[PDB]
Design a protein around this ligand. Structure first.
Ligand SMILES: CS(=O)(=O)Nc1ccc(C(=O)NCc2ccc(Cl)cc2Cl)cc1
Ligand SMILES: CS(=O)(=O)Nc1ccc(C(=O)NCc2ccc(Cl)cc2Cl)cc1
Ligand SMILES: CCCCCCCCCCCCCCCC
Ligand SMILES: CCCCCCCCCCCCCCCC
Ligand SMILES: CCCCCCCCCCCCCCCC
Ligand SMILES: CCCCCCCCCCCC
Ligand SMILES: CCCCCCCCCCCC
Ligand SMILES: CCCCCCCCCCCC
Ligand SMILES: CCCCCCCCCCCC
Ligand SMILES: CCCCCCCCCCC
Ligand SMILES: CCCCCCCCCCC
Ligand SMILES: CCCCCCCCCCC
Ligand SMILES: CCCCCCCCCC
Ligand SMILES: CCCCCCCC
Ligand SMILES: CCCCCCCC
Ligand SMILES: CCCCC
Ligand SMILES: CCCCC
Ligand SMILES: CCCCC
Ligand SMILES: [K+]
Ligand SMILES: [K+]
Ligand SMILES: [K+]
Ligand SMILES: [K+]
Ligand SMILES: [K+]
Lengths: 280, 276
C-alpha cells in the first residue's frame, strides 16, 4: 500500500514544482506586459489630479482624497452619482438577480454585482454550496447530450472517409473536427455577435468568451453588463450559450489535460535518453 | 432500440434543467428581496453626499463635479498592481479559475497571453489539485482507520457509523479549512467574522467575486502571511472539491428518495380512488 503512495507523493511534488515554476514565468510575463501601462496611467492620473488640486484651493484638499474614497467605495455596489443622470436602473431587479444566481452556481462569478447585505452573503454561501453541485449535474447532462449529437455526426463522417484507413489515426481527424466546429459555434460566432451587440473589440470578445467559459470570470467584461438597449432575444440566447459553451470548454480543457499527460510521458522518457547518451 | 435510451436520457436532462431553472428563480427572488433595499438606501444616501459636497464646499461648481467623476471612472479601469508578487497572485487567479479580477489585464498582449496561460494552466493546475486531493484523502484514510477501530468494538455497529465518519470529515474539515483561516483573516484583514467566512466560501468554491481578497488591501503583511494563504488555497480547494462532490451525492440520494415518495403518493391516491 505504501509502495504506490511513495511513488504518488513523488509525482505530486514534481507537478507542484512545475506549477510553482509555471506561476513564476507567468508572473514575469504579465508584469512585463502590464507594469508599463500601469505606470504611464499612474503618472498621467497624478497630472490630472494636480490640475484640480491647485485649480480649486478652497477645497480642503485632504478631503479630495477622501471624496474619491467615498466614490470608489460606493462604485463597487454600482453607482451613477451624476446630476445629468440622477434617475437610475436597478442592479438587483428581476433579471439581474437571476444573472447573479447564474454567476454563483456556474462559479463564473463575474462580481460586477455581489451581495452587500449580511443576509445576501449568508444566502449566497448556502445558495452556492447547494447550487454548484446541482448545476454540475445539469452541465453533465448537457455534456452528454451534446456528446451524442457529435457521436451521430462522426458516424456519418467516419463512413464516407473510409478509403483505401486506420482505427487509431481517424481518431486524430475526429478531434480536429471537434475543435474546428466547436471553436466556430462556441467561440467565434458568439464573439462576433458580442462584438456587434456590446461594441467590444474582436479581441475583447474572444477574451470575454474564454474568461467566461473557463469559469475564471474576472468580470472586466460582462455580456448584458451595460444599459444599452438589448433585444431580449439576446440575453436568453447568452444563457443557452453559457450552458452549452461551458460543456464545450469542459471537454476542451479536459483534452488539453490529456495532451499534457502525453507530452509529460514523452518528455519524461526523452530526459532519460538525454541523460544516458551524455556523449551526444 | 438506440433512440429508446436517448429519449430516456433527454427526459433526465430536461427535468434537471427545469430544477436548475427553478433553482435560479427562487434564488433570483431571494437575492432581490435581500439586496434591492440596500441598493435604494445607498442610492438615496449617495445623492445626499453628492449635493452635500456642493454646499459644504461652494468653491466647486456643479459642472466640474461631473468631470471629476468621469476621471475617477476612467481610473477604476486601472486602479503597484503588477509588481513581482501581484502578477504571481494574478497567475494564481487564472489557473485556479477563482479569478477575483481586482487585477486583470488591460494590454491586448496581456489578454492574449491570459487566454493562452489559462488554457494550458487550468488543466496543469488540475493535476496538482488532484494530487493534493489524493494525498489529503489518504491522510484522512489513516485518520479514520484509527477512529473506526476505537468506536467499532462496542456500541451500535455498521452501516450507521459511515454517517458519523462523514460528520467528522465535515466537522474537522470546516475547522481546518474554513473556521481557522477565517479567524486569521478576520484579524489580519480587519474583515468581519461573516465577511471572512463569506470570503473563504466564495474563494474556495472558485466563484471568486473579488469583493474581498486576502492580501488585497495596502496593509503591512507579515512575510509569512501570503504564502500561508497560497498553501490554504491549494489544500482548501481540494477540500471543497470533495465537499461539493459529497453534496452532489446527497442530491442524487434525495432525488431518488423524492422520486419514489411521489411514486408512493401517486400509488395511494390510486387505490384510494378505486375505492368507490
Ligand atoms: C451589470 S447588471 O447585473 O446590472 N446587468 C445584467 C448583466 C448581465 C445579464 C445576463 O443575463 N447576461 C447573460 C449571462 C447569463 C448568465 C450567466 Cl452565468 C452569465 C451571463 Cl454573461 C443580465 C443583467
Ligand atoms: C491589488 S494587488 O494585486 O496588489 N493585491 C493582491 C492580492 C492578493 C495577493 C496574494 O498573493 N493573495 C493570496 C492568494 C494567493 C493566490 C490566490 Cl489564487 C489567491 C489569493 Cl487570495 C497579492 C496582491
Ligand atoms: C479569429 C481567431 C479565433 C481563434 C479562436 C481561439 C481558439 C481557442 C480554442 C483552443 C484550441 C485551439 C487549437 C489550436 C492548436 C494549436
Ligand atoms: C482583430 C484582432 C483579432 C485577434 C485574434 C488573435 C487571437 C489569437 C488566440 C491565440 C490562441 C492560441 C491557442 C493555443 C492553444 C494552446
Ligand atoms: C507560459 C509558458 C510556460 C512553460 C512551462 C515551463 C516548462 C517547464 C519544463 C519543466 C521540465 C521539468 C523536467 C523534469 C523531467 C523529469
Ligand atoms: C446543436 C447544438 C446547439 C448549437 C446552437 C448554437 C448556439 C450559439 C449561441 C450563440 C449566441 C451568442
Ligand atoms: C506554447 C507553450 C507550451 C508550454 C508546454 C508545457 C509543457 C509542460 C510539460 C510538463 C512536464 C512534467
Ligand atoms: C531546463 C531544461 C529544458 C529541457 C527542454 C525540453 C523541452 C521539452 C519539449 C518536449 C517536446 C517533445
Ligand atoms: C427547489 C426545490 C423544489 C422541489 C422540486 C420537486 C421536483 C419534483 C419532481 C420529482 C420527480 C418525479
Ligand atoms: C431580460 C432578462 C433575461 C432573462 C432570460 C430568462 C430565460 C432563461 C431561459 C434559458 C434558456
Ligand atoms: C503577444 C505576446 C506573446 C508572448 C509569448 C510568450 C511565449 C513564452 C514561451 C516560453 C517557452
Ligand atoms: C457567522 C454565521 C455564518 C452561518 C453560515 C451558515 C452555513 C450553513 C451551511 C448549510 C449548507
Ligand atoms: C434544498 C432542496 C434541494 C432539492 C433538490 C431535489 C431534486 C429533485 C429531483 C427530482
Ligand atoms: C432524442 C432527443 C430529443 C432532442 C430534442 C432537440 C434537441 C437536439
Ligand atoms: C493544517 C491547517 C492549515 C490551515 C492554514 C490556515 C491559514 C490561513
Ligand atoms: C439575516 C437574514 C438571514 C436570511 C437567510
Ligand atoms: C459537483 C457535482 C457534479 C456531479 C457530476
Ligand atoms: C459580419 C462581420 C464579420 C466580422 C469578421
Ligand atoms: K470576479
Ligand atoms: K470569478
Ligand atoms: K470557477
Ligand atoms: K471548476
Ligand atoms: K470564478
Amino acid at each position: 500500500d505504501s509502495a504506490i503512495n511513495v511513488m504518488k507523493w513523488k509525482t505530486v511534488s514534481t507537478i507542484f514544482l512545475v506549477v510553482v515554476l509555471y506561476l513564476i514565468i507567468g508572473a514575469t510575463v504579465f508584469k512585463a506586459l502590464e507594469q508599463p501601462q500601469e505606470i504611464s496611467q499612474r503618472t498621467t492620473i497624478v497630472i490630472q489630479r494636480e490640475k484640480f488640486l491647485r485649480a480649486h484651493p478652497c477645497v480642503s484638499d485632504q478631503e479630495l482624497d477622501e471624496l474619491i474614497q467615498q466614490i470608489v467605495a460606493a462604485i463597487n455596489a454600482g453607482i451613477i452619482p451624476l446630476g445629468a443622470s440622477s434617475n437610475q436602473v436597478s442592479h438587483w431587479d428581476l433579471g439581474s438577480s437571476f444573472f447573479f444566481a447564474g454567476t454563483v452556481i456556474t462559479t463564473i462569478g463575474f462580481g460586477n454585482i455581489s451581495p452587500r447585505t449580511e443576509g445576501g452573503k449568508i444566502f449566497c454561501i448556502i445558495y452556492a454550496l447547494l447550487g454548484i453541485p446541482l448545476f454540475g449535474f445539469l452541465l453533465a447532462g448537457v455534456g452528454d447530450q451534446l456528446g451524442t449529437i457529435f457521436g451521430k455526426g462522426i458516424a456519418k463522417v467516419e463512413d464516407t472517409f473510409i478509403k483505401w484507413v486506420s482505427q487509431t489515426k481517424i481518431r486524430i481527424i475526429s478531434t480536429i473536427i471537434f475543435i474546428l466546429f466547436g471553436c466556430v459555434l462556441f467561440v467565434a460566432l458568439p464573439a462576433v455577435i458580442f462584438k456587434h451587440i456590446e461594441g467590444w473589440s474582436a479581441l475583447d470578445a474572444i477574451y470575454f468568451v474564454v474568461i467566461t467559459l473557463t469559469t475564471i470570470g474576472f468580470g472586466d467584461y460582462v455580456a448584458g453588463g451595460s444599459d444599452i438597449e438589448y433585444l431580449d432575444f439576446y440575453k436568453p440566447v447568452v444563457w443557452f450559450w453559457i450552458l452549452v459553451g461551458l460543456a464545450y470548454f469542459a471537454a476542451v480543457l479536459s483534452m488539453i489535460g490529456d495532451w499534457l499527460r502525453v507530452i509529460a510521458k514523452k518528455t519524461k522518457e526523452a530526459v532519460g535518453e538525454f541523460r544516458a547518451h551524455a556523449a551526444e
